[PDB]
């Protein structure tokens, strides 16, 4: 079987300065926390690589949380397209209900799809060493930890893509994944923008914190997803 | 005369969420510290307004800085094109050692540039009231604190497209203008980020500043160019 879905070689728009540490990303599998459920996370290099059921998935997935206004600094909704350039400008990860290590077409997403998200150089190229980060977890799964899983994932991969340090631009305070993910992963608050974002349902505008993490020395207890 | 160079229903690709608070944005005369010199800062709301000698003038101006690379993330030259989208994305400001309020053509850009900066949105449109600007002095005019007074209109005019809050992203600590300019004008160091960036001339990676302030709150002192 073809492994180039695989091939950190594939990575497009990804660091300039630094090559990847390893030569592919194989998919990763585990459970989800405090249960038996098996969870697999599988690269996304370019999105030939992945079913067009799960972008059309993923894209109306985005959009509801654009629409509802409270966690991303878009207004707009994203066409299908619009989503695809976005999302998978340079790498993403598919979180699946699954034991398979492949993706199989056509399945139930909105059972099946757990999370995704995208990594990219926060910034042009002598700071593309710096990665950015957006997550999107699937509602039909709330309360079951998947964000927190999302991010292990993260840390396991970014740095086999070169990056070495991590820069979240905008998590809104009012975001519970800022204290139930980041600060328990030990990502730093490195800044804060006051009344950063005009949120939805929000009558006064609402603070962001800037997280920072260096993955070149990640703890071992946050890697190991057992 | 028409006045349609100097109208802020003219911004382009402004704040999302906020209206301009003045209908113009007037030219604002000053003398370069310390001298008798007198210099005016101009809008630039569409690269029409500006003679084109003058964009080719800080097409290569930019560049020269890029090529240094001690400032910008940028790796590589623009094209003349490619600095037209970028520097006047939204909003510029040219300031010329004159003391007419009007911008003449073929002048000798190398002595009668000042200076320049451009304001934009730094995030998406919910977070669109945070402008970003970024600053290039003419070599030929270092050490008469031309950064300083393109800070001063800058403050006075960023609030007027409709911005609430200055964010620089990237303020690498190695850039003297840190010091010299956003300190000195309460602009608060709201973040740090380690090692952020690759810079020619340095073998270590350099930390950059990310720099804050409230724009509807500023200092009479540092509004006054007197």
């Known amino acids: 079987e073809s492994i180039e879905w695989k091939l950190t070689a594939n990575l497009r728009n990804g660091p300039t300065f630094f090559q990847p540490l390893a030569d592919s990303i ?11 459920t098996v969870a697999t996370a599988f690269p996304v290099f370019d999105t030939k690589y992945i079913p067009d059921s799960l972008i059309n998935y993923l894209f109306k997935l985005f959009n509801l949380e654009i629409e509802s206004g409270k966690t991303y600094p878009q207004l707009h909704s994203l066409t299908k397209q619009g989503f695809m350039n976005y999302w998978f400008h340079s790498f993403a990860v598919v979180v699946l209900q699954t034991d398979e290590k492949f993706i199989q077409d056509n399945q139930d997403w909105n059972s099946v799809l757990l999370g995704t998200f995208y990594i990219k150089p926060n910034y042009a190229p002598r700071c593309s060493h710096n990665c950015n980060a957006g997550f999107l977890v699937n509602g039909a799964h709330r309360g079951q930890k998947v964000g927190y899983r999302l991010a292990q994932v993260y840390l396991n991969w970014a740095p086999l893509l070169g990056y070495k340090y991590s820069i979240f631009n905008l998590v809104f305070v009012t975001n519970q994944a800022s204290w139930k993910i980041w600060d328990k992963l030990n990502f730093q ?18 603070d962001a914190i800037i997280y920072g993490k260096d993955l070149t020395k990640i ?7 057992e």
Chains 1, 2 share one sequence.
């Open 26 to 36: 194989e998919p990763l599998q585990f459970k989800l926390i405090g249960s038996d």
């Open 189 to 206: 608050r490195i800044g804060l923008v006051p009344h950063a974002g005009i949120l939805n349902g929000f009558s006064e505008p609402v």
């Open 219 to 225: 703890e071992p207890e946050f890697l190991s997803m």
